[PDB]
Short mmCIF file of C-alpha atoms in Angstrom, two decimals:
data_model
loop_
_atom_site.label_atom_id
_atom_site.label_comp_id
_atom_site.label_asym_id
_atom_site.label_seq_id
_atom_site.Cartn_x
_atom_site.Cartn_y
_atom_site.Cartn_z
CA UNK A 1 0.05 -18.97 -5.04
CA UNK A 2 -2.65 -20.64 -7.36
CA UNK A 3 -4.95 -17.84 -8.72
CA UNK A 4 -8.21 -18.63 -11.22
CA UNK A 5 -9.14 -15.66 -12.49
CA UNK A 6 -13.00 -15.91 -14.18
CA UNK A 7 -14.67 -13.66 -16.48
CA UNK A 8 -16.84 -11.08 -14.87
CA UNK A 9 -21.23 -11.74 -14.85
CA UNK A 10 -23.31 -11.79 -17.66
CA UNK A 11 -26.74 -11.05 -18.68
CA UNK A 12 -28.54 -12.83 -21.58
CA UNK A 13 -31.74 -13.99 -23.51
CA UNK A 14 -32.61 -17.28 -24.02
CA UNK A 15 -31.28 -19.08 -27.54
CA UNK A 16 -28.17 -17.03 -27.64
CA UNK A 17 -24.62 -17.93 -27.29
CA UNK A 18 -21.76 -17.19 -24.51
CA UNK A 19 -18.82 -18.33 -23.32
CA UNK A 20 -17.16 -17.45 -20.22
CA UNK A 21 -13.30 -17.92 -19.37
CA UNK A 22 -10.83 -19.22 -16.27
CA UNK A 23 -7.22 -18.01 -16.31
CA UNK A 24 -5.18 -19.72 -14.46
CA UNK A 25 -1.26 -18.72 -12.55
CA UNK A 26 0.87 -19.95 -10.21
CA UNK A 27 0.63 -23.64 -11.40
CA UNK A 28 1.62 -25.89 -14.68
CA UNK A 29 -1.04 -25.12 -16.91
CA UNK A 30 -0.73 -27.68 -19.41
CA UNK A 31 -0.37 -30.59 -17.07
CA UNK A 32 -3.19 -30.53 -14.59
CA UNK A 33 -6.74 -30.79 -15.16
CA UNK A 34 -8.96 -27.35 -15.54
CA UNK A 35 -12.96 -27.51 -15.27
CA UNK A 36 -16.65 -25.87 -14.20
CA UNK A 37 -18.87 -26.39 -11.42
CA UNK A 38 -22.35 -25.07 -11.74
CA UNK A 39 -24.28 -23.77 -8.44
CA UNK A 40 -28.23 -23.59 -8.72
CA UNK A 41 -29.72 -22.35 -5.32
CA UNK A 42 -32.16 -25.32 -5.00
CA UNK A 43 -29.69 -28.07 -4.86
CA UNK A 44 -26.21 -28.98 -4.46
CA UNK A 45 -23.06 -28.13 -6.82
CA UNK A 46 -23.17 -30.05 -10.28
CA UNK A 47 -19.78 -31.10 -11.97
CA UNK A 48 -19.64 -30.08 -15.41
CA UNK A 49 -16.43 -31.37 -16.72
CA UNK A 50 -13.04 -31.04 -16.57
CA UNK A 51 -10.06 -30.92 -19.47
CA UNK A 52 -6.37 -31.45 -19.56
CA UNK A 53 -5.06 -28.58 -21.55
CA UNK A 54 -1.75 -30.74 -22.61
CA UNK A 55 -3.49 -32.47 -24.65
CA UNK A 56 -7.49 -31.97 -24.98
CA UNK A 57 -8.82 -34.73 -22.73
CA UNK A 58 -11.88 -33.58 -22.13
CA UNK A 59 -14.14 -35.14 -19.59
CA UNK A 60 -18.21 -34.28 -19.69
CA UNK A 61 -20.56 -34.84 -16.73
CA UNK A 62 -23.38 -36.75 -19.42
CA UNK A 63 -26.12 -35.51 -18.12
CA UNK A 64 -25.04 -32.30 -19.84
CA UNK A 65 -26.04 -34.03 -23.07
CA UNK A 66 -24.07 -31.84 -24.97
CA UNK A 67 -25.30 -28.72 -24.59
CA UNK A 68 -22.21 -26.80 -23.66
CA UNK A 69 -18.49 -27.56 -24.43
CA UNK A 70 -15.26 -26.94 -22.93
CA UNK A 71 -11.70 -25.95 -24.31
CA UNK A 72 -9.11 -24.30 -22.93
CA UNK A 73 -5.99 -22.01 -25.08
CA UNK A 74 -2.53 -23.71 -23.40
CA UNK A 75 -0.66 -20.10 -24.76
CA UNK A 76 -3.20 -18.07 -22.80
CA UNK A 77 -3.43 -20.41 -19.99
CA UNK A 78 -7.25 -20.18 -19.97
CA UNK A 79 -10.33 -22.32 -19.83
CA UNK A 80 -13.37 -21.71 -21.35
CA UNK A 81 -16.90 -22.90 -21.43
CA UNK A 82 -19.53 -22.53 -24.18
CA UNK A 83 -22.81 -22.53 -24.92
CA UNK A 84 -24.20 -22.16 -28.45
CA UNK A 85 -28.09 -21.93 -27.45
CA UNK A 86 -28.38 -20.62 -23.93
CA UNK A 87 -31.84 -21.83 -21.59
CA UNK A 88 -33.25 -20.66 -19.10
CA UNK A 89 -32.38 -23.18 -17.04
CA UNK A 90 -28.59 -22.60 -17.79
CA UNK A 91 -29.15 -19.43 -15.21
CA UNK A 92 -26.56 -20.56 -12.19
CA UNK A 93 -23.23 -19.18 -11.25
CA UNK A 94 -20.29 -20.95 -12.48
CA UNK A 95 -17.09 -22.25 -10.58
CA UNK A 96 -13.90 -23.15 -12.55
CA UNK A 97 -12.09 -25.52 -10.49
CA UNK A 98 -8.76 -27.61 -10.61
CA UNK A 99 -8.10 -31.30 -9.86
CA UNK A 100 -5.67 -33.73 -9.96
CA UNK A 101 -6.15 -37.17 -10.81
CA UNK A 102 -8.29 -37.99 -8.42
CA UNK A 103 -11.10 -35.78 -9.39
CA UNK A 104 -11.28 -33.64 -5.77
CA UNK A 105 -11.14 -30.02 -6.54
CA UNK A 106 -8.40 -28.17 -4.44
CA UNK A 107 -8.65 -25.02 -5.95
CA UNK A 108 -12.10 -22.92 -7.08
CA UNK A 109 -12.76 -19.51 -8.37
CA UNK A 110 -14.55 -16.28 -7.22
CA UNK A 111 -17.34 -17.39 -9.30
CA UNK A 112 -19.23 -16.11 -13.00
CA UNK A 113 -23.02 -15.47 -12.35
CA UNK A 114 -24.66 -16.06 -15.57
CA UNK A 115 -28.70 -14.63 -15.89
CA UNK A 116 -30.56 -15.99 -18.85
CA UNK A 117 -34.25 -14.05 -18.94
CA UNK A 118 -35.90 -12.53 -21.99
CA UNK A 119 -36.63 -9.66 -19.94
CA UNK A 120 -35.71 -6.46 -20.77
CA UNK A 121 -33.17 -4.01 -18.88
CA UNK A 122 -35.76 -1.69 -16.56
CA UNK A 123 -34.81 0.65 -13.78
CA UNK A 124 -36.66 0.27 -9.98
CA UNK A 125 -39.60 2.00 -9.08
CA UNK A 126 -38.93 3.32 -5.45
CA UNK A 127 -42.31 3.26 -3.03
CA UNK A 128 -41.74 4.33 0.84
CA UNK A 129 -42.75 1.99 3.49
CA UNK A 130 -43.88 4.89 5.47
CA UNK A 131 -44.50 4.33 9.23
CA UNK A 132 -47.49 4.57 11.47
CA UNK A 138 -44.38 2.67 20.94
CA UNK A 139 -40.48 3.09 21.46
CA UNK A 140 -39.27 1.26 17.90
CA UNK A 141 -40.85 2.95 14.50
CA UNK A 142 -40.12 1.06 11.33
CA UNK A 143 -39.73 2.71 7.78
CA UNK A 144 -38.40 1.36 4.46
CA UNK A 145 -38.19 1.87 0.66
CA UNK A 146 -39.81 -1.21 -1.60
CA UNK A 147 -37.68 -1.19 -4.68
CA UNK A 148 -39.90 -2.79 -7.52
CA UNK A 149 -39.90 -3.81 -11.17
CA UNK A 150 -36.23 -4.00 -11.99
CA UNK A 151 -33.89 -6.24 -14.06
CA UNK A 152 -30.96 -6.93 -14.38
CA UNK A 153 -29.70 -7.42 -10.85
CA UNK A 154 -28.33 -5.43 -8.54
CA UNK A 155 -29.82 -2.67 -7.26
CA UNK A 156 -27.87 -1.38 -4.37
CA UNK A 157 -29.85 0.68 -1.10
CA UNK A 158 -27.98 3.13 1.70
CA UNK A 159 -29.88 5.51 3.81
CA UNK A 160 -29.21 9.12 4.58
CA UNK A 161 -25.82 8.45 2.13
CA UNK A 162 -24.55 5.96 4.47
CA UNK A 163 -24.87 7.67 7.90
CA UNK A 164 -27.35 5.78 8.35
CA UNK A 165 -26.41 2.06 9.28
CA UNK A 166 -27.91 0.94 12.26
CA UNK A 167 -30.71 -1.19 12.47
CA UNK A 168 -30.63 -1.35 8.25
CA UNK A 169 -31.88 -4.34 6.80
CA UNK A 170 -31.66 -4.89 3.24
CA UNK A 171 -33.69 -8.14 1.69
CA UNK A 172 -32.50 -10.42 -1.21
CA UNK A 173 -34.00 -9.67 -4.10
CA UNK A 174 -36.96 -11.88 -5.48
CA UNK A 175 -37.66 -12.93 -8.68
CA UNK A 176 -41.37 -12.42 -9.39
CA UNK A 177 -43.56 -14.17 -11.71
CA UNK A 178 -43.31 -11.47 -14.76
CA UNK A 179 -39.47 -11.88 -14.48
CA UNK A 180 -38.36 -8.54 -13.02
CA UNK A 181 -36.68 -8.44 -9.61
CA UNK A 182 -38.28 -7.04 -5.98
CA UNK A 183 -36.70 -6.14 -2.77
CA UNK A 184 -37.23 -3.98 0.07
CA UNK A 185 -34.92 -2.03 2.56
CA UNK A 186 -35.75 -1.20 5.98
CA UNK A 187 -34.70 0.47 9.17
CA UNK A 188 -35.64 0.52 12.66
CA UNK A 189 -35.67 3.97 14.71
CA UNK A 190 -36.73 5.40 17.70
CA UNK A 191 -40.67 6.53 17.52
CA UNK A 192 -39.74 9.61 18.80
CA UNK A 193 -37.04 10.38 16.26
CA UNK A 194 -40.11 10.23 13.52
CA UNK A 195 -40.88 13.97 13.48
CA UNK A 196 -37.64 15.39 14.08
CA UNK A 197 -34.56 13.75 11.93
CA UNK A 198 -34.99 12.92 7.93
CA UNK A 199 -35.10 9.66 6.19
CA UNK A 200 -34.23 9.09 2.75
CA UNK A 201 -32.86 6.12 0.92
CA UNK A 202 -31.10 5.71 -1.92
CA UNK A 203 -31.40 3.60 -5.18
CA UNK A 204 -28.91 3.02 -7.25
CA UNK A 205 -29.74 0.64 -10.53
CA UNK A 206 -27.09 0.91 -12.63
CA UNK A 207 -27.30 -1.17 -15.48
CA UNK A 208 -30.14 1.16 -16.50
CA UNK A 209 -28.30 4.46 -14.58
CA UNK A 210 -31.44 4.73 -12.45
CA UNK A 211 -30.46 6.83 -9.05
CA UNK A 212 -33.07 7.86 -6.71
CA UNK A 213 -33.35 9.47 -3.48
CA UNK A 214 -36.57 8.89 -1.73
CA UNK A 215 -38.07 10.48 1.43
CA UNK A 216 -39.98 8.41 3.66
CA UNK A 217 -42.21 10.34 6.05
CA UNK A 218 -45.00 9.51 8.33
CA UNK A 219 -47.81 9.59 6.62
CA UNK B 1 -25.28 -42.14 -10.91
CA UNK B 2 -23.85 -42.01 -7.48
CA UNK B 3 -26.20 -39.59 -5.49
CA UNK B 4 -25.29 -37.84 -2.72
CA UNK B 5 -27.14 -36.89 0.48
CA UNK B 6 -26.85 -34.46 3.19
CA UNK B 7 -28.52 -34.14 6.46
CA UNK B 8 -29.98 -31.97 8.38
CA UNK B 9 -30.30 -29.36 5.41
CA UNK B 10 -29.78 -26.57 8.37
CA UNK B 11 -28.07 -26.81 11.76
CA UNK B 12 -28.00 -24.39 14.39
CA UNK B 13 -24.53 -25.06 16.93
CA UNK B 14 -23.93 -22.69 19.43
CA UNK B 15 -20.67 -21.27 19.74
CA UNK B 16 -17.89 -23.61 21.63
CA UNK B 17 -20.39 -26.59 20.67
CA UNK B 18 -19.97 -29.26 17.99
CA UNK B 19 -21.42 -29.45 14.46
CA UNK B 20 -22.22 -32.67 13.23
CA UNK B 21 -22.90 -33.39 9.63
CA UNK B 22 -24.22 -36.47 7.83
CA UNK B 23 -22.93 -37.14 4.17
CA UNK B 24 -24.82 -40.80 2.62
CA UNK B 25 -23.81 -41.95 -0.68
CA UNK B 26 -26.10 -44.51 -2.48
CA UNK B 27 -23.65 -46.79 -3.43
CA UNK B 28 -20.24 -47.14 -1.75
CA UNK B 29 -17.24 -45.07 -1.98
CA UNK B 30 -14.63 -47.30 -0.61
CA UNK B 31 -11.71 -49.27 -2.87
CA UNK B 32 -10.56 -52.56 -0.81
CA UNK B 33 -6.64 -52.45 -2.73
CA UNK B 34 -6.15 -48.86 -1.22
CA UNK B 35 -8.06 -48.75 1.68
CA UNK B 36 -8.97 -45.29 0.78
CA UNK B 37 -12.41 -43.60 1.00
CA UNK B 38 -13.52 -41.29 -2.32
CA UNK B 39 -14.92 -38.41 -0.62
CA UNK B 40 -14.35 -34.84 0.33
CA UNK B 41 -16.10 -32.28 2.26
CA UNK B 42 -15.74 -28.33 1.09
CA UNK B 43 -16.79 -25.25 2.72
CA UNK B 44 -18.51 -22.14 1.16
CA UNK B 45 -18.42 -19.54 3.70
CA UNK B 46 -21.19 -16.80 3.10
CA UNK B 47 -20.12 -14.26 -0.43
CA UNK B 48 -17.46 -16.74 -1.04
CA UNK B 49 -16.07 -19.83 -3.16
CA UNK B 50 -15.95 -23.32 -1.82
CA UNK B 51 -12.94 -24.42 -0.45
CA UNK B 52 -11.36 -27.63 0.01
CA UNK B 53 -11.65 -29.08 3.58
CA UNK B 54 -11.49 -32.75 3.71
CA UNK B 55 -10.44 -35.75 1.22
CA UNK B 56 -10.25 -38.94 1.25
CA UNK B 57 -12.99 -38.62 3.95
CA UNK B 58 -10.43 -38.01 6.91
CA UNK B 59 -7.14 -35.95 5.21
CA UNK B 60 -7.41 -31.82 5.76
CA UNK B 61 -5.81 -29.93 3.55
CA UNK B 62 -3.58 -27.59 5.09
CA UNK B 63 -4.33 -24.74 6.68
CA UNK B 64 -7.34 -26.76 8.24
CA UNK B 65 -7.78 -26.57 11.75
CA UNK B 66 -7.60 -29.62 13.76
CA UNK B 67 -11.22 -29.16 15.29
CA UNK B 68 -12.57 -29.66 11.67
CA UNK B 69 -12.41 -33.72 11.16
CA UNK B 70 -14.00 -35.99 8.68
CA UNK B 71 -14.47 -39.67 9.68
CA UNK B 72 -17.05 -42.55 8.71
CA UNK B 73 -16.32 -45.26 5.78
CA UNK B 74 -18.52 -47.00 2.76
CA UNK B 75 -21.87 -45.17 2.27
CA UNK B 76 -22.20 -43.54 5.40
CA UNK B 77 -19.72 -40.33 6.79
CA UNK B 78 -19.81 -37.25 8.87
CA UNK B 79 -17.75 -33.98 9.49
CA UNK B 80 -17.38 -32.79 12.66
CA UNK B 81 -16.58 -29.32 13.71
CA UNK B 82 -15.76 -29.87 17.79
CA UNK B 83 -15.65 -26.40 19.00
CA UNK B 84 -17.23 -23.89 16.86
CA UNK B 85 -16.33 -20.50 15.72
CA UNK B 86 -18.37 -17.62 14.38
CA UNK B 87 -16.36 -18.20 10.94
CA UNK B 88 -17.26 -21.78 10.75
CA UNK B 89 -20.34 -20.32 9.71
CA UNK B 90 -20.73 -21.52 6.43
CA UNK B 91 -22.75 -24.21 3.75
CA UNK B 92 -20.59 -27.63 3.84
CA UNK B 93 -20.88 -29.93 0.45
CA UNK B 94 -19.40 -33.37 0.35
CA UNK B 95 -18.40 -35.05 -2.79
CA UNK B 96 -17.81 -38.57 -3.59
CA UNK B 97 -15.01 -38.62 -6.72
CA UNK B 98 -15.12 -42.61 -7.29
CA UNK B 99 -16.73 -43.08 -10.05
CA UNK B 100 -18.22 -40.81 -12.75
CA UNK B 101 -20.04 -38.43 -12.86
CA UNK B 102 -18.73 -36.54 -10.03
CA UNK B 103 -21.52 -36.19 -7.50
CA UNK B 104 -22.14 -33.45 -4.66
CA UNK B 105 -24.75 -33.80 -1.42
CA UNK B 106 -27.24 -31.17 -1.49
CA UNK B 107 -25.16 -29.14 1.59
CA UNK B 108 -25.96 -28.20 5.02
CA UNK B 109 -25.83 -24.74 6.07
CA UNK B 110 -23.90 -24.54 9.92
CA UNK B 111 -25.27 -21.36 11.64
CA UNK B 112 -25.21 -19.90 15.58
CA UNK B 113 -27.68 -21.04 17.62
CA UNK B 114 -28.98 -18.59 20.24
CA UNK B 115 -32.17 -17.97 21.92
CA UNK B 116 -35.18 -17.62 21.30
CA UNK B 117 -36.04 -13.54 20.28
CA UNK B 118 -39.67 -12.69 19.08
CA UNK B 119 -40.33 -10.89 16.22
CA UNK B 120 -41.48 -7.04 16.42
CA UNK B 121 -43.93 -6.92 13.75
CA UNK B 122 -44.66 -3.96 11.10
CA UNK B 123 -47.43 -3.79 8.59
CA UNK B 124 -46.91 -1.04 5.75
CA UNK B 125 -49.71 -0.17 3.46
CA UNK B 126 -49.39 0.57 -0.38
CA UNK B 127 -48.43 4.02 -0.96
CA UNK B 128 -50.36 6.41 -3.01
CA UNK B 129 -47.69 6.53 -5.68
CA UNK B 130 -47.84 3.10 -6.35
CA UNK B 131 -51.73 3.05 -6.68
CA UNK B 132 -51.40 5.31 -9.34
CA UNK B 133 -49.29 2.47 -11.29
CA UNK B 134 -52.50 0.17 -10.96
CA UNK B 135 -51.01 -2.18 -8.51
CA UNK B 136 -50.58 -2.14 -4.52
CA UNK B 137 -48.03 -3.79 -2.85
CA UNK B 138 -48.55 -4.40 1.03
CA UNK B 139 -45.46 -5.35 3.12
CA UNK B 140 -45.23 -7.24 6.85
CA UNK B 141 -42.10 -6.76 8.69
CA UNK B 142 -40.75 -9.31 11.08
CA UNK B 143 -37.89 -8.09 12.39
CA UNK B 144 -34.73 -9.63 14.84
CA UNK B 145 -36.15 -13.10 15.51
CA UNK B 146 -34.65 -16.64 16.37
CA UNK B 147 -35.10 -19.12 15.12
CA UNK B 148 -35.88 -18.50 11.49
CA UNK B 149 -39.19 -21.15 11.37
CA UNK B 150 -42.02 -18.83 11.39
CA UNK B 151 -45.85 -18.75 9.87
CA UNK B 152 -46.90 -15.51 8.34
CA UNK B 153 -50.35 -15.10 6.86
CA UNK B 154 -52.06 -13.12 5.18
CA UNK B 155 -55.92 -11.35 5.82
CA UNK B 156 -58.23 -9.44 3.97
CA UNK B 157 -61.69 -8.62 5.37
CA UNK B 158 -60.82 -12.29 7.79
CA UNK B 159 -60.28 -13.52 4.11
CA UNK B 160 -57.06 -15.76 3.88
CA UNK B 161 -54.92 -15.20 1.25
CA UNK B 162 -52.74 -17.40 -0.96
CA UNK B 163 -50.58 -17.61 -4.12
CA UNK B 164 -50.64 -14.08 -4.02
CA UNK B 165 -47.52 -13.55 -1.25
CA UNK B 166 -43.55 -13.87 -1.55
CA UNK B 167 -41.01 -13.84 1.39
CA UNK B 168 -37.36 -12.79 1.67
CA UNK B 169 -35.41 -13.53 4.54
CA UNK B 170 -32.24 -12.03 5.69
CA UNK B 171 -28.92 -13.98 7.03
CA UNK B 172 -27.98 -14.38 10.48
CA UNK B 173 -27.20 -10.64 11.82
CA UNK B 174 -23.28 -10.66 12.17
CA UNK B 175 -23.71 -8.79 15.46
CA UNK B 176 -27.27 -10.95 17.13
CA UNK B 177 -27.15 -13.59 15.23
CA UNK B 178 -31.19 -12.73 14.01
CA UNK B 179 -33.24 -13.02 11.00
CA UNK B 180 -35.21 -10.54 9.84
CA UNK B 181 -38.29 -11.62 7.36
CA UNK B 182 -40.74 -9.79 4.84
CA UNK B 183 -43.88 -10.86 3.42
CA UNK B 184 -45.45 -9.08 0.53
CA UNK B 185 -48.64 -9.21 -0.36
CA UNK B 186 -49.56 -8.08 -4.18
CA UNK B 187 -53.09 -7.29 -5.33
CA UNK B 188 -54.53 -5.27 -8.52
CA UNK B 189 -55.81 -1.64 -7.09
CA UNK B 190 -59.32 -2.92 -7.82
CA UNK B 191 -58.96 -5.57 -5.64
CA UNK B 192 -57.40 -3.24 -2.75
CA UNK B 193 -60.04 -0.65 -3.02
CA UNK B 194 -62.78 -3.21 -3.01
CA UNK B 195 -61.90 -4.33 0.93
CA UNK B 196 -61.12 -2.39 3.99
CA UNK B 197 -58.72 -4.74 6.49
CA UNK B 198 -55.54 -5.59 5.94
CA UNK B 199 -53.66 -7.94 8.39
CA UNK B 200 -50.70 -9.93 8.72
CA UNK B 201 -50.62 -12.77 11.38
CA UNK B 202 -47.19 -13.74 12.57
CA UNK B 203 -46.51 -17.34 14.69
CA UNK B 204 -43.41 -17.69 16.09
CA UNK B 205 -42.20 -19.74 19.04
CA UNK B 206 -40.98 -16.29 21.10
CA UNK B 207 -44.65 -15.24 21.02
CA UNK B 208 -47.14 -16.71 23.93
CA UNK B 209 -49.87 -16.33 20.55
CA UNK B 210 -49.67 -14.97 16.78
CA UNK B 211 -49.50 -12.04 16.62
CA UNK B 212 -51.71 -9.56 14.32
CA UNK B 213 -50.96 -5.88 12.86
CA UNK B 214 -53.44 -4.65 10.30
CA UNK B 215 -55.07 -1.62 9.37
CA UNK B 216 -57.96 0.26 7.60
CA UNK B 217 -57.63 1.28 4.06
CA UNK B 218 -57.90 5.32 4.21
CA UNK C 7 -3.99 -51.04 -9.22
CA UNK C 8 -4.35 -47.84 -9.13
CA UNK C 9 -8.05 -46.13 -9.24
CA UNK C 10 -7.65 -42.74 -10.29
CA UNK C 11 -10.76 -41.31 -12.76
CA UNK C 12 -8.43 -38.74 -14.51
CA UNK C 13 -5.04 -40.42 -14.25
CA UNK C 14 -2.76 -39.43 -16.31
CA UNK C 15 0.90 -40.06 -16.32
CA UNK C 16 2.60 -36.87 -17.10
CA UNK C 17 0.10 -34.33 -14.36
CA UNK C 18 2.85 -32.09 -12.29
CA UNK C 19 1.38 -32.32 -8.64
CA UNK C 20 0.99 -28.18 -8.13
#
């Protein structure tokens, strides 16, 4: 079975340098063509290039005007993709796929989210949604964190119905924003607990917030 | 140069129906001496990679099922999905590989159609906690609603607001098939302690007219 | 006349 294994997600500030990998089993290496596809939310895929590891053959998309470069180590059986000077705009996640001659890709990867921000690693600051006829609704806003994820559960997980847990959104001052809610019966408001919690671990924030009526 | 359009941009099928998506190229994909259309169709199922679905605009791979088919020639195609499936949910690409740069469409996302559910609306006001950080943060809830087109807007004092709100939306509920929505409204605390009403006005094709939650500051 | 944008003679077909 074909496998492309990528390198895991990275974090970094504009003007530096990365490069993530793709190694690849179950197939001749050397003798079929290796390459990236970059995903941007507001439009479709973007072919990057592809390379024949046999014998360098590289192929560039040019409206990447040389701003990243591809290579790929036939010993290791792994692809790679560079950047010397990372942008902003270079923030996407990042498919290595394979193709034959054709240029159809039959076989993609989990994916490699790469962040470019010069923002700074910050853990959440946790604010109940607290609630005021049959349905109540409470929540926890989860503000002013970076890097991405944060990750939200209620009552340590016993709590799963009714749970609904936004995608986070990038605000202006380039720290991330979400907020998790939950629907319950009014009358449960007085009587059972509610507290979710807030894990950030890139900054080994953990928090455990009540929400009450207020 | 070869660009690569996709429409409609979202389509709602519901279950046992058929999906029908439009792939355009601006210049044609089709070789006379092979008789052989350049393009491909993937499918990128929600948390997941795209996979391979369709080449030269008709052949599955395998594995494919037979209701998936790709037809059309020259500039113009479309896949077809004849009975779907609640795992042919999923954002569908095509590709045209005949000449270079490899080009993709911008996608179409295939989701279940059901009917129409009005959104229960919740209005949260800033916490006290957060005031003391110098900014307040007011939230509007719209929660399991169909279809996902809906107007929220924001009051203060009958004031409307704009440039100062940002929406998330949830994905289709696995078990109703709803969205659920938040608005967020961000003002400085001077700004929130200088006016009394907050509302947030919700129009939606469940509801006979908007509908408004707000309340008093204090 | 084969149109193939990465041909290459020696590619093992997975």
């Amino acid at each position: 079975e074909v496998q492309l294994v990528q390198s895991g997600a990275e974090v970094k500030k504009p003007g530096e340098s990365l490069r993530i990998s793709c190694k690849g089993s179950g197939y001749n290496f050397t003798n079929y063509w290796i390459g990236w596809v970059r995903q941007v939310p507001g439009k479709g895929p973007e072919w990057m290039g592809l390379i024949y590891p046999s014998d360098s053959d590289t192929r560039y998309n040019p409206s990447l005007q040389g701003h990243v470069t591809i290579s790929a180590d036939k010993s290791l059986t792994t692809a790679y993709l560079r950047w010397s000077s990372l942008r902003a705009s270079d923030s996407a996640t990042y498919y290595c796929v394979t193709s034959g001659i054709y240029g159809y890709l039959d076989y993609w990867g989990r994916g490699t989210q790469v962040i470019v921000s010069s923002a700074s690693t910050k853990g959440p600051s946790v604010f109940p949604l607290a609630p005021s006829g049959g349905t109540a609704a409470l929540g926890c806003l989860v503000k002013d964190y970076f890097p991405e994820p944060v990750t939200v559960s209620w009552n340590s997980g016993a709590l799963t119905s009714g749970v609904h847990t936004f995608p986070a959104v990038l605000q202006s001052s380039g720290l991330y924003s979400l907020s998790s809610v939950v629907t319950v019966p009014s009358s449960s408001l007085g009587t059972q607990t509610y507290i979710c919690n807030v894990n950030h671990k890139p900054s080994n924030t953990k928090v455990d917030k009540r929400v009450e009526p207020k | 140069d070869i660009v690569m359009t996709q429409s409609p941009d979202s389509l709602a099928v519901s279950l046992g129906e058929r999906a029908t998506i439009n792939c355009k190229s601006s210049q044609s994909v089709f070789h006379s001496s092979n008789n052989k259309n350049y393009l491909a169709w993937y499918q990128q199922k929600p948390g997941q990679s795209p996979k391979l679905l369709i080449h030269w605009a008709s052949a599955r791979e395998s594995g494919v099922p037979e209701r998936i088919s790709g037809s059309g020639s020259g500039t113009d195609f479309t896949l077809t999905i004849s009975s779907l499936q609640a795992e042919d949910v999923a954002v569908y690409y095509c590709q045209q590989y005949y000449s270079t740069p490899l080009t993709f469409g911008g996608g179409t996302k295939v989701e279940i159609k059901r009917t129409v559910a009005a959104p229960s609306v919740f209005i949260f006001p800033p916490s006290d906690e957060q005031l003391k950080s110098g900014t307040a943060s007011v939230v509007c809830l719209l929660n399991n609603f169909y279809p996902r087109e809906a107007k929220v807007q924001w009051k203060v004092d009958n004031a409307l607001q704009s440039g100062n709100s940002q929406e998330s939306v949830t994905e289709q509920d696995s078990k109703d098939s709803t969205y659920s929505l938040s608005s967020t409204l961000t003002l400085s605390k001077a700004d929130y302690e200088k006016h009394k009403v907050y509302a947030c006005e919700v129009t939606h094709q469940g509801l006979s007219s908007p509908v408004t939650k707000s309340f008093n500051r204090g | 006349k084969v149109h193939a944008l990465f041909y290459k003679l020696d590619i093992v077909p997975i």
